[PDB]
Ligand binder design. Structure first.
Ligand SMILES: [Cl-]
Ligand SMILES: [Cl-]
Ligand SMILES: [Cl-]
Ligand SMILES: [Cl-]
Lengths: 391, 392
């Protein structure tokens, strides 16, 4: 069962050496006792033998083993943050002339990587609606090489129909590299590699770490794509420091108890918001009526704590400040996936600007919440006080 | 005023240290905005030293960036998870499809491999030059040459560029070229690259900045002209350094003086002895007279580090290689360098020839690269002497 796997994944004796957790091996240089030992390490430098710190130490090997088991992949590449994982995993599979097909609900830095970096390297990008399902077939070009998913979407939380998207992509381009940003699910609430996706990318920064105090990107690839991902990310010098690798493994151990609380609390708050006269719409994958909710219920095994809702009106700048500045428990900050609750606002035109090939369908101010581990009645009380300030 | 005082103090402003000697370690992704106005101010200054997002940095990163900018005389310092990431992403930040990169053929092998295995498929071509080409590099600059990549001394074989001659030649034919250098051997301070008209000085902080072989970090200090593009394009690739390693890099600066002076004295003494040794055909140490580009090192550097190489009087067969390398008492076989301990590695001539693109090597003996650590220099010499005894 998954809770037993979260506790045990990666904690083999060769990495833990008697402690419960892996050792922390801090290292650039790794010492070869003999020429024959150096030859053996050289041959196995991509297969978990100590060779060089850029390839990893015992601590990295342990985390890689854990992520491969939890996400069901053949290998796991480590990056200094989620944006690095997205950028470098896409880059590992394109050449000049290739085309990228990305959901227009992709995390904004992911879009910006395509339009600002890939574009000047001769790699084009086009977009698709997250609910496009099987109609994505007509958007696959002869030169399309990567299809990039993100389910639920960033900020607006639309859930893909991945079985329909994958089936349609494979009909037109069987050898396409299908990737997903699986951060919201922490890679475990949606088993992407079981759905025909080639690579599952996460900002471990969010729920894997779970305490908002470390940054880490991971990419777990199937056997078909792992050697190319591994070697091309390595050619860009991509790695994670040993101590953060340790903290990522450590975060796995409480991921189950944390996510169950994030799910329980955020769904309760979402249900209350959906009955609220000052709320026009609630974008929570687990709430019935939300875009792609039926796909979430069929394809996911749980929910995390991040969602959004649209207010009944567009706040003016004075109301936005009166609303946001005076919360007692919710804090304004970027990122999410930690133990504390956060709030951020976007006006409709701010979302429209980052929805290429699409138009927004709401006019109220959008509020994105991360529901942390605080008492749910206290968080509700905080939100209710905010509603009172803008009524 | 002097460098040792700067190494002790660089980056240790009270806003970062907050009462302790060293900067605080601020571990964060989320950084909290008290008000909408505060978020607006942070957003405007997210590339200007104001707390905004962990990917941009915390106080710990700002402290290190301030120190690197001061020590290397730059306008900004980008941070990367290792030196190879700094090289790959600093080159990538300036190239576009159709561009050409002109790189010394003595570049660090992973830097070459990035050019030929990543850049090539992105429509960016790379060609090479001999490290001693000097002013004759002009004829190699193409209309599409965007980056000129130096590494002085070179990897393994330690040839020192004539940077003034190279830079003047490039500027004459392509003044808008981005001139970069991998300045790792100098720890960015023994050769003040940005004072020589180089645009960006890159370092594997992994080596002498960290100084204990237990953290990986890359840095790239850019001049005012190139800093905004380096910064924003490295950021779009998600390049950053964890807060704790940033702290350890700043911490390493504090002993960088006493360490480098010991590495210099010990390695030059060993090089001088190797140069008199009948079992040694050539000593590649930038500080040793007669070494390739030594006169440029003496004119343009202010010190030496502890990494160098020498060529044996013969090519060792595989049995001799094991007998030699396996039985050292103090020197250890490992990659990397710049730590407190001494290391040894061997390369056959054809191995080096393979990583000298469009070029041949000019020696036939087995090449031995040494990093001279902080051990007693007489002990290290005796260890080498015992090694010579095994292959005589
Ligand atoms: Cl195909
Ligand atoms: Cl965010
Ligand atoms: Cl020019
Ligand atoms: Cl090395």
């Amino acid at each position: 069962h998954l809770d037993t796997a979260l506790v045990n994944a990666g904690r083999s004796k060769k990495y833990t050496q008697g402690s419960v957790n892996s050792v922390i091996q801090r290292a650039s240089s790794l010492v070869f006792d003999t020429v024959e030992a150096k030859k053996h390490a050289t041959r196995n430098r991509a297969n978990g033998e100590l060779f060089y710190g850029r390839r990893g130490t015992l601590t990295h090997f342990s985390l890689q083993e854990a992520m491969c088991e939890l996400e069901g992949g053949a290998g796991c590449a480590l990056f200094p943050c989620g944006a690095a994982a997205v950028a470098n995993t896409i880059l590992a599979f394109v050449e000049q002339g290739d085309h990228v097909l990305m959901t227009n609900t992709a995390y904004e830095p992911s879009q910006d990587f395509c339009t600002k970096i890939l574009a000047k390297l001769g790699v084009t990008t086009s977009w698709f609606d997250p609910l496009i399902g099987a109609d994505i077939a007509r958007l696959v070009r002869p030169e399309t090489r990567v299809v990039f998913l993100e389910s639920p979407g960033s900020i607006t939380m639309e859930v893909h129909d991945v079985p329909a998207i994958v089936a349609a992509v494979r009909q037109v381009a069987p050898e396409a590299i299908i990737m997903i940003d699986n951060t919201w699910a922490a890679g475990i609430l949606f088993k992407a590699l079981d759905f025909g996706i080639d690579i599952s990318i996460q900002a471990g920064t969010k729920y894997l770490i779970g305490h908002s105090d470390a940054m880490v990107g991971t990419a777990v690839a199937n056997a078909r794509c792992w050697p190319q991902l591994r070697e091309n990310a390595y050619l860009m010098g991509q790695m994670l420091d040993a101590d953060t690798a340790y903290m990522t493994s450590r975060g796995l151990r409480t991921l189950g108890v944390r996510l169950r609380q994030h799910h329980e609390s955020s769904l309760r708050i979402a249900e209350w918001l959906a009955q609220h006269p000052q709320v026009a719409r609630v974008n929570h994958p687990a709430l019935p009526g939300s875009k792609g909710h039926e796909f979430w219920k069929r394809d996911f095994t749980g929910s995390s704590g991040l969602f959004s809702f649209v207010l009944s009106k567009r706040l003016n700048d004075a109301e936005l400040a009166e609303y946001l500045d005076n919360f007692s428990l919710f804090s304004m900050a970027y990122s999410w996936g930690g133990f504390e609750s956060l709030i951020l606002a976007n006006q409709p035109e701010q979302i429209a600007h980052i929805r290429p090939d699409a138009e927004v369908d709401f006019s109220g101010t959008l509020i994105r919440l991360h529901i942390g581990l605080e008492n749910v009645d206290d968080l509700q009380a905080d939100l209710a006080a905010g509603f009172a300030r803008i009524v």
